[PDB]
Amino acid sequence: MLGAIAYTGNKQSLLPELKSHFPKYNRFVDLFCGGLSVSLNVNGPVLANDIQEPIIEMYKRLINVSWDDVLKVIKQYKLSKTSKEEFLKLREDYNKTRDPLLLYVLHFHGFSNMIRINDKGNFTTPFGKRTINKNSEKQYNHFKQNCDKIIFSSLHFKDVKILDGDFVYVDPPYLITVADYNKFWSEDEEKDLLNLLDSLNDRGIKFGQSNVLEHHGKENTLLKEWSKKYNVKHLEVYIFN
Amino acid sequence: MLGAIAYTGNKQSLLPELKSHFPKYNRFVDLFCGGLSVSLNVNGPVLANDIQEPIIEMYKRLINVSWDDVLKVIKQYKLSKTSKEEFLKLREDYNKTRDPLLLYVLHFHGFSNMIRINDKGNFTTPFGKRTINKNSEKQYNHFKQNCDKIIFSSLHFKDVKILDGDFVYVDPPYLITVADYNKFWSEDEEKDLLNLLDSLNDRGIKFGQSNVLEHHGKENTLLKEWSKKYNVKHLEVYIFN
DNA sequence: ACAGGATCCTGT
DNA sequence: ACAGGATCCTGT
Numbered sequence A, B: 001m002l003g004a005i006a007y008t009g010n011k012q013s014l015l016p017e018l019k020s021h022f023p024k025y026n027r028f029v030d031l032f033c034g035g036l037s038v039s040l041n042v043n044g045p046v047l048a049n050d051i052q053e054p055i056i057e058m059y060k061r062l063i064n065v066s067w068d069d070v071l072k073v074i075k076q077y078k079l080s081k082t083s084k085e086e087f088l089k090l091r092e093d094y095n096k097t098r099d100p101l102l103l104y105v106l107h108f109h110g111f112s113n114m115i116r117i118n119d120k121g122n123f124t125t126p127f128g129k130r131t132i133n134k135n136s137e138k139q140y141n142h143f144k145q146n147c148d149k150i151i152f153s154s155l156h157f158k159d160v161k162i163l164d165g166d167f168v169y170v171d172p173p174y175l176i177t178v179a180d181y182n183k184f185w186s187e188d189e190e191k192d193l194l195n196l197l198d199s200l201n202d203r204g205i206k207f208g209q210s211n212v213l214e215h216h217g218k219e220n221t222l223l224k225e226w227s228k229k230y231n232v233k234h235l236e237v238y239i240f241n
Numbered sequence C, D: 001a002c003a004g005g006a007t008c009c010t011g012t
Ligand SMILES: Nc1ncnc2c1ncn2[C@@H]1O[C@H](CSCC[C@H](N)C(=O)O)[C@@H](O)[C@H]1O
Pocket: A003, A007, A008, A009, A010, A011, A012, A031, A032, A033, A034, A035, A036, A037, A038, A050, A051, A052, A155, A156, A157, A158, A171, A172, A173, A181, A184, A185, A189
């Protein structure tokens, strides 16, 4: 259902389907949570993880923050649909101080609500000629009313203790797809992950996996094959074991 | 809402507002209907009027015509996004035969869908390097599904029997604005109209009036004053009594 | 400056 | 999750 923040490639729509293919588990470990549309909406306990400390931090802070808190920032900087300088300044400040909340308030004003953090910790998204709508408070609330069951981590899937009896939903950057986070992926990672996956299968530990096998001419050769070894659903495919 | 044909200065947007300021009436008499965005969308009975026979006729014919009818013409002349000769020929034909339907099919291909009839009955708009889009069928349908309540007339507002108990929305050529039909207006007409309006006020007969009081340096001096005597809304002003 | 498509947004 | 109305965008 509803995620925490607009996230490119959210699972606000497929989730239901996917949920029709999930098992039992002592702990849901979302290896790639990003938006959180998946974590917030799956019986816990949940280990929300994402290799981007910035956004995880923001989540960690969002924990003890009120809507009123957010507003006080908008009014503090005089943000709005047209406030361009302000946004810059707000961005300016977040870059220097790195206060999560700032980042949070930030994105709502970024070009297409997209959080884009470069390799120096700076927020580069341009002004979105926007502000907060009504999905803003609704999304926010969901998180609040469901963040309890979640345990965040800003680890790289590589080093993430997978404690037996836990389902591991994994929606990694689609190799054959565009998106800010594809700047983190490499063919190697693809390999690693898969191995790392076969490995979880070797411990009875079941998992879920979403991806694209072929999109816009290209196709994920190596993955297309690797999938055969397991079940695949077509809705975009969910390769689960 | 949706008019019958793209018309410079349509009221597809203001209408709602304007309707928020309308009274009851036994007959809606649209003195300047042009595009029809106003007639088709106002509880009838409606007297759609415009001093341009050609476009009114087109309407009168449109009455008993089907979309399929329109297409048969397009295929008949082999019209398209690039068919320049054809357009000319089609125009060529409409000029000679003066068949409304031809004119109808015509404009969809004219430069900016603009119907421009000179003082000799000829269509002069140049080829628009276009053809029919999505809005073409949609606009068409609206008319069909709403033309019933309308009674057309190709009269000059001067001689138009205003039968008591009728609201008279009047969107005449804006004196201080450019547009093909401004070739019909003169400062005198402005005077006349206004008198003609005060006169309807003298019979309890209420009316609606849209115009621009000041636009691009210029201002409708004489009108700006005349308006004070009545109510004025700012959205462009609707001077109603 | 406008159309008309694209997408956004909101309530439901 | 949708409808479709309200906005954003962009080729003329
Ligand atoms: N090398 C890497 N290791 C771990 N996580 C990574 C990674 N590269 C990217 N990621 C994270 O995984 C995300 C995949 S996209 C998010 C999908 C999620 N279902 C959603 O609704 O949010 C990336 O945005 C990034 O946050």
